[PDB]
Amino acid sequence: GEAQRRKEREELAQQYEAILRECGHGRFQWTLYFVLGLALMADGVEVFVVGFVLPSAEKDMCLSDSNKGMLGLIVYLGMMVGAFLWGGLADRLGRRQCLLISLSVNSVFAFFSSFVQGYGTFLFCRLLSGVGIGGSIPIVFSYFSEFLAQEKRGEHLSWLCMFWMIGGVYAAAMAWAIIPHYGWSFQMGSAYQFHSWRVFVLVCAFPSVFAIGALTTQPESPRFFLENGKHDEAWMVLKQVHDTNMRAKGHPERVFSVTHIKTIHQEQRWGVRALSLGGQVWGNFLSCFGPEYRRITLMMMGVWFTMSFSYYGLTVWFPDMIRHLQAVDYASRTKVFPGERVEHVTFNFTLENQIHRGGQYFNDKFIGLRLKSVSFEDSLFEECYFEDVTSSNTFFRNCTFINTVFYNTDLFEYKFVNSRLINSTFLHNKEGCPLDVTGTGEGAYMVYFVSFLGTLAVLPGNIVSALLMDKIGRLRMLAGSSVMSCVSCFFLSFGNSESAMIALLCLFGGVSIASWNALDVLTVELYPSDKRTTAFGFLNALCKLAAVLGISIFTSFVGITKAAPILFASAALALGSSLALKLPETRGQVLQ
Template sequence: MEDDNRYRDGRSEFIRGAKDIAKVAKKQVGKKVGRGVDRMADEYTRRSYKRFEEEDDDDDYGVSGDAGYYRSDSRGDEDAHSDSTEGHDEEDEIYEGEYQGIPRAEGKGPGLDGPPQTYRDLALAEGERRKDQEELAEQYETILQECGHGKFQWTLYFCLGLALMADGVEIFVVGFVLPFAEKDMCLSEPNKGMLGLIVYLGMMVGAFVWGGLADRIGRRQTLLISLSINSVFAFFSSFVQGYSSFLFCRLLSGVGIGGSIPIVFSYYSEFLAQEKRGEHLSWLCMFWMIGGIYASAMAWAIIPHYGWSFQMGSAYQFHSWRVFVLVCAFPSVAAISALTTMPESPRFFLENGKHDEAWMILKQVHDTNMRAKGYPERVFSVTTIKTVKPRDELVDMGDGAPWYDKWRIKLTALFHQVWENFQAVFSPEYRRTTYMMMAVWFSMSFSYYGLTVWFPDMIKYLQKQDYASRTKVFMKEKVEHVTFNFTLENQIHRQGAYFNDKFVNLKMKSMVFEDSLFEECYFEDVTSSNTFFKNCTFIATLFYNTDLFKYRLINSKLVNSTFMHNKEGCLLSDVGDDNNAYMVYFVSFLGTLAVLPGNIVSALLMDKIGRLRMLAGSSVISCVSCFLLSFGNSESAMIALLCLFGGISIASWNSLDVLTVELYPSDKRTTAFGFLNALCKLAAVLGISIFTSFVGITKAVPILFASGALAAGSFLALKLPETRGQVLK
């Protein structure tokens, strides 16, 4: 019996000991697994944790001291360890969902009674952000070097070139259609002037708005929106009939295309390495020239052909100039289609903390170029790219708020962010650079746009002078029982007498009758332009289906005379000569084509002699060529000087575009570029208004204004910092 009891007691002790050993082994295995997991987490997060700072290999795991309890049995040891140490490390970090342990006596644990760090020092945060931007700029340049320059950049070059081409087309559209649109819309001289300037005003607004938005919502997205607005309203403008609606459509079309130049250059520059940037941005400028050539060629081929039209009664007319307006929207539509296949700028993503999106795009650039060069096996070696923490994000109101409140808050926040970014362009760090760039942009635009619009007007004035010199004058002629059925042009008849004469199915161009008598005459199917009857007397005369309205009869008397079925139309004072229209298109074509040599030279030398030397040197030579205009007294001489000025000044524009891209950091680049381009359009409006007011009066004032502006611009350009050889900020 005793042997059985001893056997049972020994067996119980054996079982109890086995259980204790199993518990200890399980506990030790759990510790090792926990340490292994911690090591893996440390490698992933690159932090060093030390779990379970004090571990004993003894069987006693009790806790003493301030914890205030101790248990000697193995069950108590396990519970004590689990209760007191689980979830703790050396830095007293707390894992979500675990027991928080006992506060240490020497200090308070985090998050208990200490004040939360809710606010950060703004100056410190801005300093950290600037440091991140500098590190990103250096690393980004290295990444672009690894990606290389190849198929991807050339594909993007043609896509963005179409957008720049659309901007070049927009400049010429209204000027080409104006002589023909005035016939359909009965435009007065003030209305014609407003229609010529409205595009520049729209582009001024668009450059500022889209430039600011591109730094907040992305280059590609903003460019697609702006080009879509341009395409839609350019399309509508070809169909609307009234002057006000046409003016409104061209204004919004200009607003849309205004974002093209600021975004295109900034967008493309962020895919170019340092040694390629100046050259290839200059090559991109060639598409503006191609846009001008396209507009001139289409105008030459389409507008003079009035047969390309249809009419629905007297209310709706669609003449050939409207076909031209429609065709001019094609580059913008093509640019939209091409841009849908291209990615966003990776630099924009990195500046806004979007690492993965930027990495994928840079990998796409690398792989596309390597495959095109015959190295598909080369792997994109970059694994981590420095990102910049964005200053703020758009407001998220949750799912419960009404949609209009969400949009209102988001748009308000976006407006404030854009405005703050614009104000940063005038911060002490960039203030001097911005003011200097404003002066250079203004002087260049004032002289260039003022002269390029003044040239065609001067040519027209010279043509009118030559036309007037060939005017035939007839004095005191008497004509009876004669039928006139041929064109009468460029004649002055004074003190004439016409009895029982017929003017049937003819055109009168620049005809003036002064102090003449028309008795029992008959006018039928007469079309006139720049034709007037001054101090004339009409006795028993019938006007049937003519456009000889009473406002063409100046101080004239009508005795028993009748007007029947007058033609609907406008009083046109210009010489309606198709040859004149062809000459305008031809001059614009030559002037645009003349910039090709300047484009080539600037592209090849931009990275060799530097941006400032190119800008200042070409501005000085442009100033000299502008001064030579004072010696141009013939039409051919003016055309030659126009080509010379355009070919030289394009190098200044290319240098200015590259400088503007490189002087400002990525988060302010399109904002600054958009503002400066808006100032450029304002200067263009002022230059055009001032220069054209002197047409026919004097050539000296416009030439002096333009030369002085160019000289001042070349001097100020030398005060700007050189950006050749620098990484993109």
């Protein structure tokens, strides 16, 4: 029984490879390459949106701690759910069908989140958008693989990873060109406000819609038709590839010589259909953990988890350390004035990064002043008057207020820590958040630039991988890039300034991309066509879970020491490379 079915798969794979060789490489493959590249560009764009809009969304939504982190981590949870779901559904519904459904869901919920005003609703919309976009990479790679001959499969598949970097560059450029315009205050509904980061969200939701539009004009992969017992349309699609390729070549007169293709023999209503689909998907998932594929699946799990953990941890660690260094430099410049006695005189000023200690102000009226990181300590205010006071990161600690009036000020109760107020009046308090929300200004610009630089770092290695994939191999490229990633991880200690962090980020990003390409190609080539999307989606869900874990662990380690992130990244990458070196070789083989 098993031998006959194995022989049938082998002969089907060999005839499919012969047909693909006869059709040849040409315009059809490049058209599908661009379409799936747009589909991958959508995924590449999706991972930057929350990180770029958080500085404005914290003030525009009164976002506290334990809410910014969940917003940052929600896209990966959504991706983890969606990757598994769509990878399971793609082996029973079709690669193109599930890709259209997932991309449409992502587009719809990304459009919905751009107008959402609340936080929990924003969390739900972003989680659903992550679910929609999670299934992009597995389906796209498994869909493009089934149109390539064995002569150049690593090269043509590794060329498909340029669009992820293109999407990252697009996101960085859009953030640089849209977000800094804080003046935009479009008003539709008095209770609601439309800022620039929502426009950025719209522009970042655009490429998924473009991907859907491009994908609507492509045909289903013939291999999925052949596996499911559908022979006529697989022949039609292969023929269409033939005419497109040879018409582009310049010989639109030859005939598709293939007549018959061997096909795998196939052996309340809504609930029954759902139960059948779930059972079949579970069967595919369990057969992924079968006697034939059990060493392979665990080794792939190890490699995916380790590389995802290290990569996402370091990628979230670099900007956090740049911010920490900037904060340390800012706190080093703080001015201190211990003690000052002030008599009747009006006060206007704008003070930044100052601490006034032991002040004694008698009958002082403070009119129209802006405070940024200004702290009054051990001060006494008597018969004072605060009018038109706007403050950020300003606190009154150990202060005593007597007969003072706070008119038209945003000095809320959380800004008086361990203070004593006697006979004081608060009148016409400005509208504001109940707690602190911090403030981000011009320093956003460089952030975009930094992101851009990181994405550009990817550009060289990709080329090299795409130009060398079939020359050395998937295993050797994967190992030789993971080893360099580990070396760059060790080299992290030799940097403590912002420029050093930027250079280190560029080095790591330019080094790890070849390993990621190799893992993608190897995962595509190591599974049968009736389990390719299921296995790829399960491994991608594992990748997203490792991304969550690594991001949390590496962000919890900022400002403490530079040894823990280095140790974690190096150990994980060494384990991943060691596990990857034990994988089988798939170069020079038919797509079985």
